[PDB]
Motif scaffolding. Sequence first.
Motif, short mmCIF file in Angstrom:
data_model
loop_
_atom_site.label_atom_id
_atom_site.label_comp_id
_atom_site.label_asym_id
_atom_site.label_seq_id
_atom_site.Cartn_x
_atom_site.Cartn_y
_atom_site.Cartn_z
N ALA A 1 -40.01 -20.07 28.23
CA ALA A 1 -40.65 -18.94 27.54
C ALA A 1 -39.63 -17.94 26.99
CB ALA A 1 -41.65 -18.22 28.48
N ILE B 1 -38.86 -9.96 33.84
CA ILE B 1 -39.73 -10.61 32.88
C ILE B 1 -39.72 -9.80 31.60
CG2 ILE B 1 -41.17 -11.72 34.57
CD1 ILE B 1 -43.27 -9.54 34.03
N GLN B 2 -39.90 -10.51 30.49
CA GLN B 2 -39.92 -9.94 29.17
C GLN B 2 -41.24 -10.24 28.52
OE1 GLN B 2 -37.52 -12.25 30.13
NE2 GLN B 2 -35.90 -10.74 30.53
N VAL B 3 -41.85 -9.20 27.97
CA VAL B 3 -43.09 -9.32 27.23
C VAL B 3 -42.86 -8.83 25.80
CG1 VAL B 3 -45.51 -8.65 27.05
CG2 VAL B 3 -44.41 -8.85 29.30
N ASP B 4 -43.07 -9.73 24.85
CA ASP B 4 -42.94 -9.44 23.43
C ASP B 4 -44.09 -8.54 22.96
OD1 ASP B 4 -42.63 -9.55 20.63
OD2 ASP B 4 -42.27 -11.73 20.66
N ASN C 1 -39.41 -5.29 23.29
CA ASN C 1 -39.40 -6.08 24.49
C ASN C 1 -39.74 -5.16 25.64
OD1 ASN C 1 -38.75 -7.64 26.80
ND2 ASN C 1 -36.80 -8.34 25.93
N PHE D 1 -44.62 -17.05 31.01
CA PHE D 1 -44.03 -15.79 30.66
C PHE D 1 -42.53 -15.93 30.79
CE2 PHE D 1 -45.81 -15.68 34.97
CZ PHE D 1 -44.68 -15.51 35.75
N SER D 2 -41.83 -15.20 29.93
CA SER D 2 -40.36 -15.20 29.89
C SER D 2 -39.84 -14.62 31.19
CB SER D 2 -39.88 -14.38 28.69
OG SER D 2 -38.45 -14.27 28.65
#
Length: 109
Positions: free
Chosen positions: A24, A103-106, A83, A4-5
Motif C-alpha cells: 500500500a 501509517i499513511q493516509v492519502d 499525507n 493501508f500504507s
Amino acid sequence: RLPFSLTIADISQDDEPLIYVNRAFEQMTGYSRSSVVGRNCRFLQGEKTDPGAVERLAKAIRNCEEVEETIYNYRADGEGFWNHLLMGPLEDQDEKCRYFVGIQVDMGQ
Ligand SMILES: Cc1cc2nc3c(=O)[nH]c(=O)nc-3n(C[C@H](O)[C@H](O)[C@H](O)CO)c2cc1C
C-alpha cells in the motif's frame, strides 16, 4: 500487505532508515520497496512541506512519543498530496525505543 500504507523505521540507526514498507505504501507513493528501504522517509517531502509539522514529527521521534500530523508529500512522479501520518513506538515497553511504526493516509490534493 494490509489495506493501508504501513512503514517501520529503525530509529536507533543513523538517520532513522525505513526497514519495512508494504505494498500500500508503494502504491500510494509510487516508490518501489527496494528504492526506499534503508532511507529516511523524508524523501517524500519537498518545497511546500511545513517546517513546523516536520519539527513536531522529529520531536516525537526524539522523545519516543506518538504523533499525528498532516504533511505535504510528493509521489515519485512529483505529484503533491496531503499525507495524514500517524506514528509512534512499535513496542510500548521497549525502554530503548528502537522501532517506530507509521501509517499513511492519502488525503489528496
Ligand atoms: C515510521 C516513520 C514513518 C514516516 N513516514 C513519513 C511519511 O510518510 N511522510 C513524511 O513526510 N514523513 C514521514 N516520516 C518522518 C520523516 O521520516 C522524519 O522523521 C521527519 O520529517 C522529521 O525529520 C516518518 C517517520 C517515521 C519514523
